[PDB]
Each structure stands twice: as structure tokens, then as C-alpha cells.
Design a protein around this nucleic acid. Sequence first.
RNA 1: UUUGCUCCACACAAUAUAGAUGGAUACGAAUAAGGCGUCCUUGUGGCGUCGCUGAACCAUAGCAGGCUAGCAACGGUGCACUUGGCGGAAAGGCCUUGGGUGCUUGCUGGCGAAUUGCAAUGUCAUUUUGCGUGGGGAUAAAUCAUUUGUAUACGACUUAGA
RNA 2: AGAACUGGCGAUGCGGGAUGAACCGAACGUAGAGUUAAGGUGCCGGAAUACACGCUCAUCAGACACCACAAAAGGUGUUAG
RNA 3: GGCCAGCAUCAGUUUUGGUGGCAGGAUAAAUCCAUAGGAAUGUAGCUUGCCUCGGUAAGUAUUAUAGCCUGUG
Lengths: 106, 197, 191, 193, 172, 136
Amino acid sequence: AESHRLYVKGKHLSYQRSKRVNNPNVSLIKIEGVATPQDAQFYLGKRIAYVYRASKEVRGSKIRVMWGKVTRTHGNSGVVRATFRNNLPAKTFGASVRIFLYPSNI
Amino acid sequence: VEPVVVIDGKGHLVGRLASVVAKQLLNGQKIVVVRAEELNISGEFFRNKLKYHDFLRKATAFNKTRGPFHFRAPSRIFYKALRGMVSHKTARGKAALERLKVFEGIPPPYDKKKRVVVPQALRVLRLKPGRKYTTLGKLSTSVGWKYEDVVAKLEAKRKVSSAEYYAKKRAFTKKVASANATAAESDVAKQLAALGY
Amino acid sequence: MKYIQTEQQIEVPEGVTVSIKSRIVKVVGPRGTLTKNLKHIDVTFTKVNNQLIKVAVHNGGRKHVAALRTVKSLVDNMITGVTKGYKYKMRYVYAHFPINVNIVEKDGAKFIEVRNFLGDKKIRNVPVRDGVTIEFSTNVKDEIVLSGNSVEDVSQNAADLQQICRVRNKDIRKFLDGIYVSHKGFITEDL
Amino acid sequence: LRSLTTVWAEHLSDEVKRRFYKNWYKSKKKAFTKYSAKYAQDGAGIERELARIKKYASVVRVLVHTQIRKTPLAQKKAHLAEIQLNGGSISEKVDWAREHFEKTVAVDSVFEQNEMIDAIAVTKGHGFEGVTHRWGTKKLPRKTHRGLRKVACIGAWHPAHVMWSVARAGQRGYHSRTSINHKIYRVGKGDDE
Amino acid sequence: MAHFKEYQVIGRRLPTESVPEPKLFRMRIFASNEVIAKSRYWYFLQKLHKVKKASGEIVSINQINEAHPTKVKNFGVWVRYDSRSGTHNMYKEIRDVSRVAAVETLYQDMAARHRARFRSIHILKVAEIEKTADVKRQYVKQFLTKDLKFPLPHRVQKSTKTFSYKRPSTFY
Amino acid sequence: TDSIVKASNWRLVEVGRVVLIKKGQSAGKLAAIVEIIDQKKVLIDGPKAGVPRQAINLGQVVLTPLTFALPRGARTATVSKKWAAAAVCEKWAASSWAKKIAQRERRAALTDFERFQVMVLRKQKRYTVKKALAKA
RNA sequence: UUUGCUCCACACAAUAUAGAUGGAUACGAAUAAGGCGUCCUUGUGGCGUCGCUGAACCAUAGCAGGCUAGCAACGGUGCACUUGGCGGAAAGGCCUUGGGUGCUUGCUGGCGAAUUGCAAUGUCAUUUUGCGUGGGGAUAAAUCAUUUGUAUACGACUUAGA
RNA sequence: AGAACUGGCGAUGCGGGAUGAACCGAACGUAGAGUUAAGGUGCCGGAAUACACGCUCAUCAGACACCACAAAAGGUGUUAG
RNA sequence: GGCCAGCAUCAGUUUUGGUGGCAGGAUAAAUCCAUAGGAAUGUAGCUUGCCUCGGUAAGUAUUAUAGCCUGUG
Ligand SMILES: [Mg+2]
Ligand SMILES: [Mg+2]
Ligand SMILES: [Mg+2]
Ligand SMILES: [Mg+2]
Ligand SMILES: [Mg+2]
Ligand SMILES: [Mg+2]
Ligand SMILES: [Mg+2]
Ligand SMILES: [Mg+2]
Ligand SMILES: [Mg+2]
Ligand SMILES: [Mg+2]
Ligand SMILES: [Mg+2]
Ligand SMILES: [Mg+2]
Ligand SMILES: [Mg+2]
Ligand SMILES: [Mg+2]
Ligand SMILES: [Mg+2]
Ligand SMILES: [Mg+2]
Ligand SMILES: [Mg+2]
Ligand SMILES: [Mg+2]
Ligand SMILES: [Mg+2]
Ligand SMILES: [Mg+2]
Ligand SMILES: [Mg+2]
Ligand SMILES: [Mg+2]
Ligand SMILES: [Mg+2]
Ligand SMILES: [Mg+2]
Ligand SMILES: [Mg+2]
Ligand SMILES: [Mg+2]
Ligand SMILES: [Mg+2]
Ligand SMILES: [Mg+2]
Ligand SMILES: [Mg+2]
Ligand SMILES: [Mg+2]
Ligand SMILES: [Mg+2]
Ligand SMILES: [Mg+2]
Ligand SMILES: [Mg+2]
């Protein structure tokens, strides 16, 4: 129909970090409607896609994707940590991200 | 959640409105705040006035032009509380701040777009009852801001038009309810009851 | 320690009706009508019967409760002011210079105009407040009378005048010159 | 305060037109030639502009200019400027203006004998001026090396910066001043030996 | 210092040839676990007897549970404490449903009103005040008037989300 | 010309006021205020609902408009007998509150298919109402 | 300066993107008080009801949504017209009339879908610009040099010149 | 300024104390995953605008060891004795 | 079989849930039941006194037309 969404909206927030040192290998993800670690346990393992655009066409497309997985929950408010195939660029802190429903367990 | 969130400043506490606005920006949520003149600061009026003159003395001794800038407007006071909570000399910070717009009164677009509130910074929900506090509009005018009267006037005008809009709407949903009524007690209706509707 | 409740009684008499919504008080009686805003306090008003109104504080501290009584008094003094009303009297006082006192009007004004205080060539002008009427008492020497429905306005108009006649640069023990409030009471006689 | 419209007269003296240009002689002098048209069609468009001023507008100013040709000056290009109108109601104001398009106004209609007036103008120019005459600084003693119309100390050692408040050589004159309380002793008429 | 249990602790001086069967002394001790409780025991015994733990033994340790944990009770409480410039005895009244609950709020109170940390206090006695009218401190008496009732004005709902679309109401 | 004094009309903490427990193992469950400890703690009991006699912080409970006759400090058995006596359950159940609760519990339970049905059913309703709201 | 400029139209090319993926869904005011309904004596009024979160409301089925038939309704909605009116706080958007046309999942039918091979964002948004095409529209000026001296160190300023 | 015992800095990065030789934590091969220390978790900033009982309103409140100061003496502010 | 992936079954490490069986203690303490006795923030009844036809209040009154407390089992 009008909606075709098969993923949950989400947001690239930080890298895993200290006060003064970040670690590009782990990204922090806020998932729409997930408020607690208990809620967030659902998404552990789900796969994330950061979808972006580019000028050069490649394998016949101007759209590219960086793929990753959710790995564990983070803190008390349903934030989640995730790792990616290649660490996310960091211009993308605050960019949208897609959390799929596979691998599924329902 | 929505592309742009319009916050009705009235009855909010500056630094708590600030703290949540900065956060939403940093996470990529565009925000526009309205009626910043109806913002609050805890502590009675005199204290915050004193606090503001403390601010006023700070300036670059050799050249007052390069020194700290004292914006008098209730929106710019507000922006200051905000900017202070955003790593604003980084590109990421600049980015965040562009997602922000702050206003006195509710000017067009936003007067016909819905505004929300932020309960964790609602004065009436946070301050112990009894405690003295301060309206931004009044604090500003006393330190130079020139346009309380003309905001007040425009608002009063705007408020007339919106009570009409409202009156109409409330009249249109009396009919709409007088619809959900025949339809009541019908097969489709109790079927929908069954499923929680 | 927080007292769980204390309350006050506000008697209401045959003449008047008092209505309170939010905490906007309105008392109306014979001598007119008075309204006063109590939103700055946090009390809870309650009608028990056409002659009685309770005012209470739940789970209040000292300063809160302290305020509860003064709420009672304020609405009392409105009620009286609207039955009996108030009348403050003042006397002129001077050792050599007759203090000359009159009522003038500049652009629908009404002002108390004081001349010659302590010889002063300057002319003093206290405003007549709305609500309060001023009459120079016949049969009495150098007395001024200010009456009205509002203790607050009458008393305040009173003190404005008495303050307009402060003495500077003199031993004010010796130079006792002025206009002083000399009787505080009611308009309606007998009571 | 923000301007929201300007309505112009249909005919504009070459004098003001000259103001709209930097090379009159070479120009095709096309200024306002399409605007001037707007009157043509009954008036419709000019009207709604006057109309709109009246509907809104918290203040009204007129656009006036000088008849510089009635003057010994060579300068030939006139002076254009906004004068606030301060008579009656907003509507009555614009009506007045509209009525006075291409029409003419004289001092006796704004100043009278013995009136206190102010004068806004740019101060005579003097070019680059040393510190002594520009700030009225002491002449340093005759004995001093490297010159003596100066300030001897340009600041303490801290703040380690010359400060905005010490006197320095620089432009003198050609300043805006708003100087007040000048009594009109005469309002003269030109057609009056 | 925590969430208290109450213990009976029983101890004695070690036996000797010429004195087998030493006397046996018990204390009720409020502490969060038996390790803290046996320590407190020796602390207080060494303020009363020629003993230390090196020459004594704990005979028994036993947690005492409230007898009627859902009966509201008016407690008299007696405390000794140390201030910055002197040491002092105090009587407080606490109303709760178990000695244990009672002692938890005491330490809280002593901390808040007097800045007394746990090290500086000695519970001297905690006892249930049987008949009212031997209840002595007003902040409690208040709560035993007949047919007592009261509102809780200015209700404050917790939000679950950062934005609201209404404008709350503190009614109740 | 009578006086007319507003009111403001709060639910009271009092023996016999029924409350809905919001946090905890109970939670969603009703209970009665038996006795009353200070301004912040009360003793609750709710046998019908299976919630244990306990002291609880008012802040964890939300007072309801329902009240019934209880003797202060009535024990659990006695509490059960007055509760049933006053049929507080069906009274609660009658209320818009409890009904709104039950409604979203139901919505929460809908199968994906059931959801699809609900949408079909709303299209349907929308069709006849949009008509009615259109003739007069 | 080799046919330039501008608004509307579509076509191709390129360049981006602080980050569309059903919907930013409009009283005001109070909070020790309010919203809504209803009656009335229209008020600081009577009576009813609601809250305890948007966990809502609205939308949502159809090749990413194909091709078709019918019925019940006369309702909904997209589009382009056209009627009357409103909005200057940054109005640049809101409401209203009328015929036209499409869609309608309100209900009932006929056909289509595979092989993209067990997933691979599987490409459906909106920025700016460039080149031609043809339907409207419009046909300037500034600067150098010269010149004034109400100006000036030099620039700049201020004048003058078909 | 000068001694005693130990532990350090000097010769040493790393996490904390914003900052800092010496304090707290912890001593270093190149890395993955996990758990912590000292210290934090409104926002800057990773992490509860968490829970709970009190106390505090300052027309120069207060806000965390080393540490970047305040005293005698006063108050019918308020709190508990 | 170069490059990169998905799923399955395992192994090492680890994290986060659901659920079953037991042990201890005042062989938890409570509630609940039975029983004895008691009291007041005194339930019914009663008395007297104002008071719009029964409501208030101040007496009495210990289970009655509510209940609670304490001990023992
Ligand atoms: Mg003197
Ligand atoms: Mg003298
Ligand atoms: Mg215009
Ligand atoms: Mg010179
Ligand atoms: Mg001089
Ligand atoms: Mg001079
Ligand atoms: Mg000098
Ligand atoms: Mg020399
Ligand atoms: Mg016990
Ligand atoms: Mg960008
Ligand atoms: Mg109501
Ligand atoms: Mg209404
Ligand atoms: Mg009403
Ligand atoms: Mg809604
Ligand atoms: Mg379709
Ligand atoms: Mg704008
Ligand atoms: Mg079909
Ligand atoms: Mg073209
Ligand atoms: Mg050391
Ligand atoms: Mg060396
Ligand atoms: Mg080291
Ligand atoms: Mg560091
Ligand atoms: Mg420091
Ligand atoms: Mg910062
Ligand atoms: Mg954080
Ligand atoms: Mg938590
Ligand atoms: Mg210390
Ligand atoms: Mg004191
Ligand atoms: Mg691979
Ligand atoms: Mg395994
Ligand atoms: Mg188990
Ligand atoms: Mg009873
Ligand atoms: Mg028993």
C-alpha cells in the first residue's frame, strides 16, 4: 500500500566511548520505541543497514549500504550497541539506520 | 518520530527545556521552540535579574566588540542555555544547531502546526509549589529587549483567530460524534468493540 | 514538620455574598463590591453554608500555615469593607507654619495638594486613589478624612500623604511637623 | 520596524530621477517608466497598495525631494528622503500623501517663528588627523625625540593590547551629528524683497 | 549503613580451668548481615566487659523477625549520638510496621537532621509504645486522631516519553 | 445571590479507599487502605486480588474514586468480607478507567490477522458514517 | 563579444544530500484546578461526564500495487479548472462555490503474478547546475578614462559630462 | 629549612582527579571478546532527568579527598534535641 | 576452487532470559483457623441535652446491629 517498511527506524548516535576516547569499532544505536534493555533484547542479532547515496553508479546503482548486526544492549534506556562490516563513517552520528526483523525468532 | 517538533515554550524551565532540546538535535531531531517569552527560570525575578547583570559585566577589556555578546531577546537567552550544552565549535555541533529554530510568539507556519510540551521541564510539574520563579519575557525587557508589547499585541490577535478555529472544530466534532452513534449498536460496531475498538 | 491540616473560618453576614473561582475572590455587599486575587498562595476554600466558608491548608509547613491566617483576614477585611467600610482620620500638625490642604484636579484627577509645609514654597501633591473619597472634616481643626471600601487603598492613600510630609535636615524629634493618621475605624456608626 | 510597500507618484521630476543614476548623460533614463504605467489601467494596482498601507502600517512616511535647481549649487542631482507624517490617523495620513503626489510643500507648513528645532547633518571633513587635534591631547614637551603631537603612553603593560579607549591618529570630521535646540529666528519667503 | 535485620547475638568469655561456664551475655543488634552484627556485638561488649573477641566466643547468632509485620505500631526510640562538638542523648518517636523498618528510617533521620553517620549512633532502646497518650512527639500524634483522612494535592504523573501532546493536569 | 465557593474535590487517603497498585509484583491489582502510617506510607490489603497485606508508599499506588466501609486496621479476612459485601470489583469494572485498561489489553493481544480484520471493519464503518455526517 | 535575458512547459545530461520511507494531527487559560456534553436565570450558574498519558487519533488490503466486470450508494478522495472570502509576525498559506475527470478495499466477480532461483536498500526521495527545443514576456546599466571639491595619504567620497 | 621509616616522582606511559611530575586506580609485546578499578551516569559526554527518607531558599545559596582557604561572635529564619 | 556472504549442526569463551527439584531458620515470622483475656482513636444498645420530625453532640456501655489488640494451641 502506502507503507512498505519491513524494518524498525533507528539512529546512529555515538561510537562506544570514554569521556575522552572513542572506539570506532562499536556503534551505538537508538531504536524507535525501545525504552529498556528488556525491550532491547528482542533485537539482539537483528541486522542493521545504513543506506546511503553516492554520485558514481557502481553495480548499476547510486545507492550503497553498510551492513551490520546488533550485538548487546547498552545502559538503561533501550539503547543498543552494534558492529558493522566496516565501522560507520561518523558524519552519520544522528543519521537514520534500519533494523530488520531477521534472523527471526517468532 | 515526526520530521519537525514544535515546542510551546510557555511554562517550561529554561535549562531543562535546553537540556532536552540539545539532545534531540544531537540525535538528529529538528526542533522549533515557540513563545520563548513565556519561558520560566526558577528563582524569583530579582535573582535572575542580578544574575543577568553579572553576565553583563563580562566583556573584552581592549575591545568590547570581541568580547562576550549579550543577547537580550528571550529566544536568544534561551539559545544561550542551549548552545552551552552542545559541542558547538565542532562541525557535528554546528550541524545539530541548524536543526534548531527559536521564536518569540508563534509566527507563521507554526501557528497552524501543532505544538507539544516536554513534561520533564514543565515548571508546573517540577517546581515545588510555593517556590518563586521568573518569566523570561519580563526578565528580558528589564535588560533591554524591545518587543514585549508588540509580541503581546500580535499574540492577542493570533489568539483571537485560533479560538475561532477551535470553536469551529469543536462544533464539527459534535456532529462527527453524533455520527458514531447511529453506527453504535450496529453489527460492524460491536464487532469492532470485540477487537478493542 | 508539616501539619496535615489547619483551617480557618470566615464568617459571612446577612448583607453579602462572596464567590471564589480558582482563587479569584469577589465579595459583594451594601457599600459596593470588592475582588482580590489569591492565586499566589495555595489554600483551599470551601462553602459550608451561606454564613460560613472554611479555608484550609493540607500538609503545610510553618510559612505556608502562617499564610493561612492572613488569607482569612484579607477576605474578612473585604467583607467588613463592604458592610461597614473604612474611615481613616488624620490631623495636620505644625509648630508655626499652618499646613494648608486642598483638593485639586488636573485632567479629571483629584489630588491632595499640600501647601506651606514648614514654610515650604514647594507644593505637594498626593493622588486621590480610586475607591477612596476625601473630606475635610467640619467642626474639627486641621483634620482630614479618607474613607472607602478598601482598607488597603484607604490606609495606603493615608500613608502616602503622611509620607509626603517627612521632614529633612532637621531633628525630627523637635520639628514634629506633618500630617499624621490619628484614628482608624469604620464608616457606619453605632458599630 | 519593517517597510512593506512603497507607492510612488506617476510623474517624477528629472531631479529625483537623476538621483537614481550614476551616469545620467549616458543612460536611457528608463527609471520608473514601467511603474508610471501602473496608473494607466484605471488605477487598480496603485490603489491596493495605498489600500494595504492603510490596512496595516503602524507608521507612515512620505518620500520627498529637494528642488535643487532652485539653488545656486552646481550639483544638479536632487536629494530624496523619508519624512514621518505625524498628523491624524493612519488612513488620514496616506490620503494626505496620495493627495500630495507631484504636489509641493513649504517650510511655513512645518516650522514657525521661535520654534526649537534640531539639525541632522554630516560634519565638515578634515582627513587624517594626528592625536593632538583629534582628541585634544597635550602637546608633549619640546625636548621629546620622535615627535611630540602624540600620546606618550598608549597603555599599561597589561592588558597587553592597545585598548579601544586610548586616543589615536585618524579620520577627523565627516561625521553624522544630531544637534538640538536651535531656535528659528526667521522663516523667510523667497518672493519677498 | 543498609537494610537492617535484627539479631540476637550471644557471647561469652572463653572457658578456663578455674572458670568453666562463663556468664553469657546477649544483645539485640540491628545490622544488615551477620558479619556486621557479630562485629557490633564485640564493639559494645568491649564498652561493658573485660573481653575482646580474641578471648571470647560468639555462642549464638539468630535473626529476630517482627512478631506482627502488618500491624502498624508507634515506636519510642532512644538514641545516643556524637555531634561535631559533643556527644548527646535523644528520644525520637517513629511510626512504622516493624522495629527493623523503624530503625532504617531513624538512621536516615539522624543523617538528614543531624548529619550523624552510622558510626556515630548508638541505639539505646527501641520499644513499642502500647497505649496512645504516652505517645509524646506531635509529628506522630497528628496521625492517630479519629477517622483521619487527607488528600494529596497537586498530583504529579511521571511521563514515559519526552513529548506530551496535552498539557498535564495535577488534579487527583 | 448565594455565595458559591468552587470546591476542589480530592480522593482521600483513608481507611476503605480502594487503590490501584502501579509498581511491583502486584501491579494493576486493586487493594484497600487499611490503616495509615504517615503522609507517605499506608497499610494496604487486597485479598480478592491476591495482593499481600503490606506497608506501601503512596507513591506506588494511585487512589481511585471508589471507597467502601472498613474499620481502621481490619485484618485480611475482615477485609475480604467487607470488600465482597460492597462489591467493589464490579464497581471498578463498571468504570471508564478499568474499561480503558481492559481495552488496550485487548488491543495488545490482537493477532496480525485480527488487526487486518479491524482495518477492514473500520473501512466499513467509515463508509456509513461519512455518509451520515453529510446528509444533515 | 557572433542570438543574449526572463517566467511557464519536457527532454537529455551532470552535481549533490548532517540523512523522506503512512500523517509536524493548530484554542486559550488554570494546575489548592480543568476538558467535554447538556440545561438555563448567560453566571465566579445548575446538572452530567472524562482523566490515572499519544498504548491515541487518522490513515492502512490490490504488479511499489497490474488488466478487467457488476451492484449498493450520492458518500469519500486525487487532479486540473472555476465562484466568493480570509490571512502581513516571516502573510506566500487557509477556507468556500460550481461543473469536469480519475480512483474507491462499501459489497460481489473474471484474468495476471513463478526463473529475482533460500537474504543481499535491491534502487520508487529532493539539491543545485549545464546544453539544446518552443509557448508567453522584457529590451539596462555599472565600471575605467575625463571632471567637481561639500571629499581625499592611496583606494574611497561627492559632482559634472550625447 | 632540616632528620626518621615506608611508599613514590626523577627513569613511566595508561584510566580517574577539567587542567597539573609526585594524589586515587592501575604499571605497558601486537590484537579479539568479556568483566572491572578509581571515578562517573540532566546536557556538553559513554552511563537511571532511577528509586527512597529527610534537610536547605541565600537582593553576592550550594555543589565531593589531596585542592586551590575563612574565624571569633551573632540571628524571634527553619529543623530536630 | 579465488572473493564475500546466509543458514544448519558443533567446539572455546562469554552475556541475557524462562522453567524443575531440593536444604536451612522460631523446622522462617505473618495471614487463616481455634481459644482464653483485654482495651479504645468505643461498634450496637441506653441515658440525658440542644435540635426542620432524626440527626448531631457527652455520657454510659466491652461484641451486641463493626471491629481491633495480647497470649496459648
Ligand atoms: Mg538627620
Ligand atoms: Mg542641622
Ligand atoms: Mg507587496
Ligand atoms: Mg595639523
Ligand atoms: Mg584642548
Ligand atoms: Mg575644538
Ligand atoms: Mg598627550
Ligand atoms: Mg633628545
Ligand atoms: Mg518482635
Ligand atoms: Mg551534508
Ligand atoms: Mg466539571
Ligand atoms: Mg461548555
Ligand atoms: Mg457550570
Ligand atoms: Mg487524540
Ligand atoms: Mg489500486
Ligand atoms: Mg520561518
Ligand atoms: Mg477484485
Ligand atoms: Mg529559450
Ligand atoms: Mg604513596
Ligand atoms: Mg636527572
Ligand atoms: Mg608512573
Ligand atoms: Mg586523562
Ligand atoms: Mg579539581
Ligand atoms: Mg560544554
Ligand atoms: Mg548519555
Ligand atoms: Mg534503572
Ligand atoms: Mg576532608
Ligand atoms: Mg538555628
Ligand atoms: Mg567472506
Ligand atoms: Mg556454544
Ligand atoms: Mg528455583
Ligand atoms: Mg465499621
Ligand atoms: Mg487472635
